[PDB]
Design a binder for this molecule. Structure first.
Ligand SMILES: Nc1ncnc2c1ncn2[C@@H]1O[C@H](COP(=O)(O)OP(=O)(O)O)[C@@H](O)[C@H]1O
Ligand SMILES: [Mg+2]
Lengths: 577, 463, 63
């Protein structure tokens, strides 16, 4: 109770005097309608309060009533197949409460307080529970939602409720301390959830897209960042990531991005099907969505709510992927509120604690052994949008120092319709060497030397492009024009991948190993036949180049027949000279 | 006998002001006790007669004005140091992070360094083998030298960091015979690393046996930035202690000087002042000179400090201020390249833009071997005119070169994959030189114009 | 194996200093059972009000 009154209103920023004793980063109800705000920069008796909704029509002298706890999420069953705003309130309950417009002042609860889950316990009375141990089990859309002890709670079980239908809030396990455990618990969004151990990553994150899961792979507990100009193919890339990856659950954080490309996810996901199991796809994604014109302070809340939901489903034991886009819109939100604070800015206008908070967010990923004793992982894919289309920004060159796997979209490859628009020469990944033994185990034995041959063909092309733009394809020899043509046919028929053909929007690594092996076999025996003396210009018109070109369109079920057929024909096309 | 200044006002982001503190020195370290009891760290900037300012290290969350109190600790920042700390890991501030108990500090030292006296600094004279052949032959690290490694972004600079860490030794064989004892140490300051790179390092050190002579100052990225500023001070004062009071030859490896300079820029913006060129602070040159000029041999002292800082140039330019000022204090650079790395060559040093400004007074007769500088010059010029012949043959056609250019082509292409593509083996200096003469012996005698007559007489004609 | 010897030795040197810290802990915890307890309490309170100018209130135990 630090009940005080407003002194000054400006933008989304409310300086309230009369609040001595309120702490930093506390939930406040500003004004008569209970607009949620958070305390920063407190002095004297005052408190600078940012508000996650819009002050318009607030008047000075309205009361600010602090709560005394930081921004806390409710974590438990009933969040999958869900869509939330920045401070975790479901939008469809709002739509059933209000019209089609988001009206401020509305309070609903983040979980259903009526839906009856089917409890089954796994603790006898008298057991010793530490933090993170499972209590029991609830079925949910074909997932098996494991209800945990909160990470700060330790004691012995006084009583256990028997199995059967319950709501969320009923006390399912009561400890001997008098402490009662419901199906859910709150958590402060800025504090990383506790953990038993950090592992080191030796299992890739299979995206589905060929260039990502072959040339620049990313392991299961890996951060990965994707910058690009506007209209370059970021959001389509992350929708294909969230539509095809081999993760259990997927948290999509739309942090300051447009609404038609979130209604896309609401409308055309439940027609689809999860590839690992038989559920529909919308049963595995939680979707946090603070769009553009929804208020500007809540973007920070959006990024943190998404990452702490992902940490909850990691602690259960799942393997969560978090596609958070436009972290630079969150950096902009920080810039606007530091404008209101009249702090001094760093370079470009961003406040100085920007990189500290970006590190404090991206280090929250990474393939842990949980408190419960079973492993899990959060992988983070962060989209970065530069404000000039340059990678010399504070956001971009502070996000490339704390990630591996930096996939750098360009615009020339987007101006021609060549998708995905990955700039090969400036993208990289540091998860290759650790994913060597997994590839040698589960894909093929000679897989990494093959891929390094692809990499050195593309390097020799990017070496020769200097010369060929400085003279022409005139005056290149027989060998070097072949290197040009093989690099071009890789760029058109291995890396290039539309996401609208039904086949060839997912592409397993058996199929990508096949396509690389077809192009290496073609190249090798073509240079063998080019020392033996032919004209290259009739190598470049064989009826096998179209079949390697159409190799990517054929189905993942009828592929190995097609691969054996085209390897026979690629052996047989050159012996006819 | 603590003395809690309670009575604080104005917490803002990182800062908090204490009302009546005329006792705190400028630049003290302080405990900030919360309402509940978690203790944070802070450094005192801007002490004045009506308030004092504290920059809190970590997050400010539980803080209010009623129940919050600061307390002095160690009013100028010291490090408690022993000889014993040669198996230990630390986190910026200098607290053990491996479960072994705290050391018994036989001395305590101020972590900002006093500057050496140029009358009492003799010159760097003898070499230190790294095992990496493209270093040890063409641009030799000598003792008392600072030379950085200009990484890129995607390049494995951390892996070549660990390789020089677990592989460098001096070698008292090939000097004038010099008491083999000559103990050795690697101080390893990784500032601003990930978790992944940290688990990489504390497995890469533990597997060989090379943690029993090193010391690791590691901090992650989600640690306080002011700890990251304190880190190279800690490492250099342990190293300077060891080398000039217990006669060690210390090699100090400063990982990610870019992350140092970024933390320096953000703390300089927190100090409420105005930056300089390209947004980095004005005093950046002096603040890098403070932690590079703490290396070198000393007249009279047997010890020696050598310093490899490994830094990633931001957007691949040497005209950024970070590689600008670093190469403008340090001596030479060795420079990784994405081209050799994409062809798949480890370690991907190309020796054409690389340079050591102090090899020439470190190698030669009696120090390593007689022919060393001549071999290095001949390798450099022969690979350098092998490269442009390679670039030429993409339009000329291999027929229309002579015999001699063709031999340079084969030289370049076998050079960059037998001499550079080392793998993870250890090439002591004579194995490096015998591969050097085997590589030069794809050229005829008398094409080797730089080497004098006796070395061509004696070592030529191999492989 | 040498590093194993030295790490066993430093883990062994830790427990000596810890049991010394426990002895001094229980020593100045059982220190009310000595007749010079009043002189030392008198003395350190005198030092508290000594090294603080403008000292106003003291806080102690009723004992
Ligand atoms: N894999 C792909 N398959 C087909 N089309 C793509 C692919 N990737 C990007 N595109 C196209 O690129 C355009 C860019 O979309 P979007 O990702 O929203 O751009 P932005 O980079 O601004 O988010 C889309 O209209 C889409 O048609
Ligand atoms: Mg977009």
């Amino acid at each position: 109770m630090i009940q005080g009154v407003i002194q000054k209103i400006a933008g989304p920023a409310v300086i309230a005097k009369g609040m001595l004793g309120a702490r930093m980063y506390d939930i406040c109800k500003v004004g008569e309608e209970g607009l949620v705000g958070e305390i920063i920069r407190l002095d004297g008796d005052t408190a600078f309060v940012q508000v996650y909704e819009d002050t318009s029509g607030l008047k000075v002298g309205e009361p600010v009533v602090s709560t005394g706890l930081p921004l806390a999420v409710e974590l438990g069953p009933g969040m999958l197949n869900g869509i939330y705003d920045g401070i975790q309130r479901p939008l469809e309950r709002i739509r059933e409460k209000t019209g089609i417009y988001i009206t401020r002042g509305v309070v609903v609860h983040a979980l259903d307080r009526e839906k009856k889950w089917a409890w089954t316990p796994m603790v006898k009375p008298g057991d010793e529970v530490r933090g993170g141990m499972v209590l029991g089990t609830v079925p949910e859309f074909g997932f098996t939602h494991k209800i945990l002890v909160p990470p700060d709670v330790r004691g012995r079980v006084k009583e256990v409720k028997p199995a059967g239908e319950y709501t969320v809030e009923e006390p399912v396990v009561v400890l001997e301390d008098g402490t009662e455990l419901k199906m859910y618990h709150t958590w402060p969004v800025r504090r990383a959830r506790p953990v038993q151990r950090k592992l080191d990553p030796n299992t890739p994150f299979l995206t589905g897209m060929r260039i990502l899961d072959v040339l620049f792979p990313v392991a299961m507990g890996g951060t990965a960042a994707i910058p690009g100009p506007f209209g370059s193919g970021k959001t389509v890339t992350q929708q294909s990531l969230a539509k095809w990856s081999n993760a259990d659950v997927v948290v999509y954080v739309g942090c300051g991005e447009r609404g038609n490309e979130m209604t896309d996810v609401l409308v055309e996901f439940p027609e689809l099907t999860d590839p690992k199991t038989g559920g529909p796809l919308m049963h595995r994604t939680v979707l946090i969505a603070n769009t553009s014109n929804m208020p500007v302070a809540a973007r920070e809340a959006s990024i943190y709510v998404g990452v702490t939901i992902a940490e909850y489903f990691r602690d259960q034991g799942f393997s969560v992927a978090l596609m958070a886009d436009s972290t630079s819109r969150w950096a902009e939100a920080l810039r606007e509120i530091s404008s209101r604070l009249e702090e001094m800015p760093a370079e470009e206008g961003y406040p100085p604690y920007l990189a500290a908070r970006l590190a404090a967010f991206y280090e929250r990923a990474g393939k842990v052994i949980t408190l419960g004793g079973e492993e899990g992982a959060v992988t983070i894919v962060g989209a970065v949008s530069p404000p000039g289309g340059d990678m010399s920004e504070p956001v971009t060159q502070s996000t490339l120092r704390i990630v591996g796997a930096f996939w750098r979209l360009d615009a020339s490859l987007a101006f021609r319709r060549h998708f995905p628009a990955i700039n090969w020469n400036g993208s990289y990944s540091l998860f290759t060497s650790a994913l060597d033994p997994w590839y040698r185990e589960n894909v093929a034995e000679d897989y990494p030397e093959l891929r390094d041959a692809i990499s050195e063909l593309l390097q020799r092309e990017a070496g020769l492009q200097e010369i060929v733009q400085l003279v022409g394809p005139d005056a290149l020899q027989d060998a070097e024009r072949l290197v040009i043509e093989v690099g071009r046919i890789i760029r058109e028929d291995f890396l290039q991948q539309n996401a609208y053909h039904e086949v060839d929007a997912y592409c397993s690594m058996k199929k990508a190993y096949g396509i690389m092996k077809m192009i290496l076999a073609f190249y090798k025996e073509a240079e063998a036949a080019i020392k033996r003396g032919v004209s290259i210009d009739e190598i470049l018109q064989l009826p096998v180049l179209e079949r390697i070109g159409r190799a990517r369109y054929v189905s993942e079920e009828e592929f190995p027949a097609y691969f054996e057929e085209a390897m026979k024909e690629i052996q047989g096309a050159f012996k006819a000279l | 006998l603590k003395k809690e200044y309670t009575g604080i006002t104005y917490i803002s982001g990182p800062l908090l002001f204490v009302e009546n503190a005329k006792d705190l020195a400028y630049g003290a370290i302080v405990d900030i006790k919360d309402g509940t009891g978690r203790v944070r760290g802070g450094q005192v900037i801007e002490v004045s007669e009506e308030y004092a300012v504290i920059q809190v290290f970590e997050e400010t969350t539980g803080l209010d004005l009623a129940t919050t109190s600061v307390s002095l600790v160690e009013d100028v920042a010291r490090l408690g140091v022993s000889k014993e700390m040669l198996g230990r890991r630390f986190n910026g501030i200098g607290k053990p992070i491996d479960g072994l108990p705290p050391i018994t500090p036989e001395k305590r030292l101020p972590i900002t360094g006093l500057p050496l006296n140029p009358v009492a600094r003799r010159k760097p004279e003898q070499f230190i083998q790294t095992g990496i052949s493209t270093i040890d032959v063409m641009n030799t690290l000598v003792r008392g030298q600072k030379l950085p490694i200009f990484s890129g972004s995607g390049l494995p600079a951390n892996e070549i960091a660990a390789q020089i860490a677990r592989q460098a030794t001096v070698r008292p064989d090939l000097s004038g015979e010099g008491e083999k004892e000559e103990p050795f140490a690697v101080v390893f300051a990784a500032m601003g690393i990930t978790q992944r790179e940290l688990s990489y390092f504390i497995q890469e050190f533990e597997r060989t046996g090379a943690l029993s002579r090193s010391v690791l100052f590691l901090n992650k990225a989600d640690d306080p930035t002011i700890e990251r500023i304190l880190t190279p001070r800690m490492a250099l004062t342990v190293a300077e202690y060891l080398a000039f009071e217990h006669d060690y030859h210390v090699l100090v490896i400063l990982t990610d000087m870019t992350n140092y300079c970024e933390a320096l820029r953000e703390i300089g913006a927190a100090r409420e002042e105005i930056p300089g060129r390209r947004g980095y602070p004005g005093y950046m040159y002096t603040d890098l000179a403070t932690i590079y000029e703490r290396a070198g041999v000393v007249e009279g002292k047997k010890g020696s400090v050598t310093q490899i800082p490994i830094l990633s140039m931001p957007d691949d330019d040497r005209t950024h201020p970070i590689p600008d000022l670093t190469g403008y204090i340090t001596e030479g650079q060795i420079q990784l390249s994405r081209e050799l790395h994409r062809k798949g060559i480890y370690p991907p040093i190309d020796p054409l833009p690389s340079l050591s400004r102090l090899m020439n007074n470190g190698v030669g007769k009696g120090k390593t071997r007689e022919d060393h500088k001549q071999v290095s010059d001949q390798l450099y010029s022969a690979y350098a005119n092998g490269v442009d012949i390679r670039k030429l043959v993409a339009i000329i056609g291999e027929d229309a070169l002579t015999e001699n250019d063709r031999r340079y082509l084969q030289f370049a292409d076998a050079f960059e994959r037998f001499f550079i593509n080392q793998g993870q083996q250890n090439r002591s200096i004579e194995e490096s030189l015998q591969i050097a003469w085997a590589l030069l012996s794809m050229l005829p005698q008398g094409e080797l114009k730089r080497i004098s007559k006796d070395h061509i007489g004696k070592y030529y004609g191999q492989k | 194996g040498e590093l194993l010897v030295a790490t066993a030795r430093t883990q062994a040197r830790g427990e000596v200093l810890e049991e010394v810290r426990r002895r001094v802990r229980e020593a100045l915890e059982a220190l009310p059972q000595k007749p010079e307890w009043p002189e030392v309490v008198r003395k350190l309170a005198l030092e508290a009000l000594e090294a603080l100018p403008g000292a106003k209130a003291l806080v102690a135990n009723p004992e």
